[PDB]
Design a protein around this ligand. Sequence first.
Ligand SMILES: [Mg+2]
Ligand SMILES: [Mg+2]
Ligand SMILES: [Mg+2]
Ligand SMILES: [Mg+2]
Ligand SMILES: [Mg+2]
Lengths: 465, 50, 153, 61, 29, 68, 52, 62
Amino acid sequence: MAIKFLEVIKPFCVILPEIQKPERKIQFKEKVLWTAITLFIFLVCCQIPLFGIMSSDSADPFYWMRVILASNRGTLMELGISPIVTSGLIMQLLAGAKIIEVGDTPKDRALFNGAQKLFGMIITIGQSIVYVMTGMYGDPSEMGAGICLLITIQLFVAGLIVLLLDELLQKGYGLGSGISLFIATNICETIVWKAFSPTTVNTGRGMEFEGAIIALFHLLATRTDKVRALREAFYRQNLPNLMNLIATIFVFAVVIYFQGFRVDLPIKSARYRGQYNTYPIKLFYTSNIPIILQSALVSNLYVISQMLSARFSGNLLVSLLGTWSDTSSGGPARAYPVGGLCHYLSPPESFGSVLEDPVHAVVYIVFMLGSCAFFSKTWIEVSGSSAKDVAKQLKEQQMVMRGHRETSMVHELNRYIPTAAAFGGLCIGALSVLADFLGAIGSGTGILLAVTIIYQYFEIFVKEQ
Amino acid sequence: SSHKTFRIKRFLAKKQKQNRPIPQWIWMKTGNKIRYNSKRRHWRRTKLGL
Amino acid sequence: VRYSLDPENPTKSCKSRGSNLRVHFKNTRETAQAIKGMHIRKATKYLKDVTLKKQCVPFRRYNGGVGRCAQAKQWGWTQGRWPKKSAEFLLHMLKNAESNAELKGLDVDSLVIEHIQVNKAPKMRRRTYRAHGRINPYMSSPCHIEMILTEKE
Amino acid sequence: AKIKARDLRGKKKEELLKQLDDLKVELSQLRVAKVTGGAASKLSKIRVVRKSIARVLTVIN
Amino acid sequence: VGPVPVLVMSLLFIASVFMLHIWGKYTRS
Amino acid sequence: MDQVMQFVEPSRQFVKDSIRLVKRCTKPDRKEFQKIAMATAIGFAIMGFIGFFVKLIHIPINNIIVGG
Amino acid sequence: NKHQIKQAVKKLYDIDVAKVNTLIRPDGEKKAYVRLAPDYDALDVANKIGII
Amino acid sequence: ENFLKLTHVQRQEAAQSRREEKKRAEKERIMNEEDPEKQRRLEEAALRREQKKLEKKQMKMK
Ligand SMILES: [Mg+2]
Ligand SMILES: [Mg+2]
Ligand SMILES: [Mg+2]
Ligand SMILES: [Mg+2]
Ligand SMILES: [Mg+2]
């Protein structure tokens, strides 16, 4: 006899701003315009620095994480999409586990959405306060209470704006999902910036262009040893290499090739004779969502571990969760987990590190593959994308497989969809690990996310068109 | 009856496969007049000879 | 489409129509002559009383064998009936004309059914079986309908 | 690859019957794709392979 | 909340952050 | 050995099912792959170009805003 | 014949056959139920040849 | 008639606005239905009506 959790949250939901759904079906061109405007606002927020940050050359523990989360350090998007993803993951997991029973009634569904939004906002507030209190922007006493409050408010407002923009796109004002568009754009921006950045960074020997292509052209023009300059550009230790760019391009092509793999199931209209359509079961049936869930969980684990290490030094549980050290080895400060679970979860930076610590690499690979497969299997059940649900959708669409009743369709789909999901998740994890080992610019996870998001957006565009 | 012959089961099979409507893709042709299938047969009224 | 009588003022006049309505043409001509001049609330009320057998429809031109009722002494006639299918066809069509006068912005509470005519549609053909191995026609007599209402204050 | 009858006349009887015994397997796999459901790019290759078999058996006879 | 109000609020927030930066520079200077 | 068999059998079944899935997967035709790659490249180029320009424009503004 | 069928599945698919049961459909074509040897698995030779 | 043709756009806009208002009122009544079983029955009927409208639109286009 549990009082409904949604009923408990219902008074708070009234305070939550909710975007009105469009009374009229929006024109496709108008949807494109809305998507462009929202993307531009998102990019501007990604570039606007937070007010009152004290300039600390403190290590970035989350540099790999920020690209996945569409977060830029020291900007209004420092939190990025992490609170929204975390709240979605938690609420979906609770619904799948049946700890929270969501009724089919619109009131229950509306409460469920409001609760997810409220949790996302609460997580955003908590994370912003946590980041301010952890000294990431400077010592809280030195910054002063007023600056800390201003930064926390700014982070909260930025997160609320992002949540509203995502709601606006999802509700059909724009194309696809705002979270997916933001992730894809951030990854594309980071890769293009690393490729073509005209900024000059002063390495001890000389001023070197950050952008791999610009640096290559400058070195070729300015150096008598053109071959040596090209080799240095290919194998630069401290800046993005042309070889790394080539590796990224190769990974991008490989990912597209795997993305194209599908199993076509022949479906016929019962009403119309001779109408043959294929139901494509993609190899990556569960999409990027297993990656997104795994990365969000790992991100939360890293944040918790860093907080616990900062506040409670030397406790056995804290050491088990993770020990962080800031390695300023001739580079911008990066906080790496040198021990504990966070250490095992962290990707090895190179084949050399994999050779030095083979156990760590094996544990990381096994964890990534297992987590991706588990998340894909759980996601199909939670999402309502199970073979039964697909068969129900086909029945609603009056599409019937030739010679097979709808129940037969369910059995055939049930044969393939679980296998497709688990194998696709394993393949995705393997591709991510391989790209990370190859050092692809923008990360293996980032490249996979961008390619798959772009492919889905293209499919949406073609279908609407 | 149920004691058919082979020539007769085969003739009934042909008379079954001739008993379907015109394909829908067939009256966007150019030199076209066939509005529908008029050579159809109902098992109750017309009794296939034999 | 091309009606028979054009309205004297298209803005304060609404139209409706019906083609190949599987009713009886004689019944529809009589339940149209009963409605021919009423006001649309009077009409919907009358046709509902006709469906509930509280008022009748005097049969004046096609009245062979049509028995005598008591509810016809309001029309000064003796014979009458209660066509239900024909009091429901030109009620779903009075509803269509309503939803076309709201699409024209008229005052539904001020509409008088001004022109209403019923025509005879192409007969549908069936066959009955009679004595001595004779087959006879069993044809259906459908009708076309078309009305025009008008604001008349 | 467009199988023309010109470059089939120099080949040998068994260098022709191996092409036949490969085209018939490609037929069987296309009449299987037809019933399992396949892409029109494949379905339209039936008319191409039935006529390639026709060209082969014609040059053989 | 309408989409246009959401956009207006986002733009106002961005402008406010710019104004805060300008005010902070003036106070420091 | 019963525990080892218990772990091995689900994995062996999963491998067999994965082989079945891969065998029934339609591999993309070269034209389909080229179309997909071109569309993905166009989307990547548009988003990267917009982000790069926005970042480049903001960098002088940020230097003026934060630098001083 | 059931003999030609047996000896032609043992040629196109290289699979020993337990028995063959034919029947001519009202459509006109001759459906044939071929039952594989005990060790050979139909489901796993249909996985091969495509139908699954 | 020419004047009515000139005014044709406004009448369509008004009809759309009134259908909307009507849909909003129906949605509000469904939201306001206290009994969950009644609410589910009304909602299922409304959704099936929408599905029938979509199928009918497809059929008319067809
Ligand atoms: Mg008389
Ligand atoms: Mg008489
Ligand atoms: Mg009598
Ligand atoms: Mg008789
Ligand atoms: Mg007789």
